[PDB]
Amino acid sequence: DNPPDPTPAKFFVPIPSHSWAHGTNTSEPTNTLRLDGGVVGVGRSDDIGTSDTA
């Protein structure tokens, strides 16, 4: 079977990039340079505290 998919085509507004201003409380679509793909971060322990920037 190859049924047709006639559902109307939605609008969409092209833009070159994401928000340049936003720093918090959001996600950021990006092309990461990892072998892995996924939400991944560098490991930590007590040897390395949390960020001290408060």
């Binding site: 322990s45 007590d46 040897d47 505290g49």
Partner: protein, 252 residues
């Protein structure tokens, strides 16, 4: 003084050293204290601990500062640390050697180490002189692209420090948890980095030292420094002569 002996002194004993202190200290910690965990990831050999040797306090220098030479921010001590304390014992050629001092005896036979330090500073003026000193420590300060703008005592007031008021004549204790770019430091010049260079310890002259105009008054005052290691772990047993020490480089 109200008793036959002057008063009750207070005693701080570690290993076979005992340090008397008559006043309230001034303390600070260079960063948050923790228990090392990733250091086990670096070495498959058991880390050796020598608590009877290394926990012991050790007299390091005496630096003399005079009335005629106290600027604002004249540096009494500017040293790569622990490098200067551990390599303090030099032969005739100013080549250090880890063999004499019993705290430093395990630096001789190992390659890498890790440990926390506590530096304690002592000034014994009489009552009628007044001054003020700041002793601060900058983690790996010598490798910093502007290390020579941070020597002003206005910059030291920000990094972890203690203050020694000469009018009150207090003690001061600066705890320094081990922090570094790698889980261990090198003990000698190997694999051709300087050995045991974790930071820079400063002693500046926050308020210049002042005395009375009388002729017999002391125009000088001494500053003494004691250091001790805490969680010292050594790894990588080798021969004592397999690597060499060369005379240290000084800071500008």
């Amino acid at each position: 003084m109200d008793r036959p002996e002057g008063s009750e002194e207070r005693t701080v004993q570690t290993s076979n050293v005992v340090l008397g202190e008559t006043n309230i200290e001034s303390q600070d910690i260079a960063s948050k204290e923790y228990s090392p965990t990733w250091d086990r990831l670096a070495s498959s050999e058991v880390s050796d601990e020598y608590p009877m040797l290394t926990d012991r306090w050790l007299f390091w220098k005496s630096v003399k500062w005079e009335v005629n030479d106290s600027a604002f921010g004249k540096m009494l001590v500017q040293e790569k640390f622990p490098q200067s304390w551990v390599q303090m014992d030099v032969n005739v050629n100013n080549i250090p050697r880890y063999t004499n001092i019993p705290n430093f005896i395990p630096f001789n036979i190992h390659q890498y180490m890790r440990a926390d330090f506590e530096v304690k500073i002592y000034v014994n003026p009489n009552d009628f002189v007044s001054g003020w000193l700041i002793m601060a420590f900058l983690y790996q300060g010598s490798e910093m692209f502007d290390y020579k703008l941070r020597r002003n005592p206005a910059a030291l007031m920000q990094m972890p420090h203690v203050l020694v008021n000469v009018g009150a004549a207090n003690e001061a204790t600066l705890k320094i948890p081990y922090r570094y770019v790698r889980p261990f430091m090198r003990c000698k010049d190997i694999l051709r980095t300087e050995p045991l260079n974790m930071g820079v310890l400063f002693v500046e002259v926050l308020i210049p030292f002042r005395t009375s105009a009388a002729s017999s008054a002391p125009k000088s005052l001494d500053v003494s420094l004691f250091v001790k290691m805490t969680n010292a772990k050594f790894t990588g047993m080798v021969d004592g002569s397999i690597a060499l020490l060369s005379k240290p480089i000084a800071l500008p």
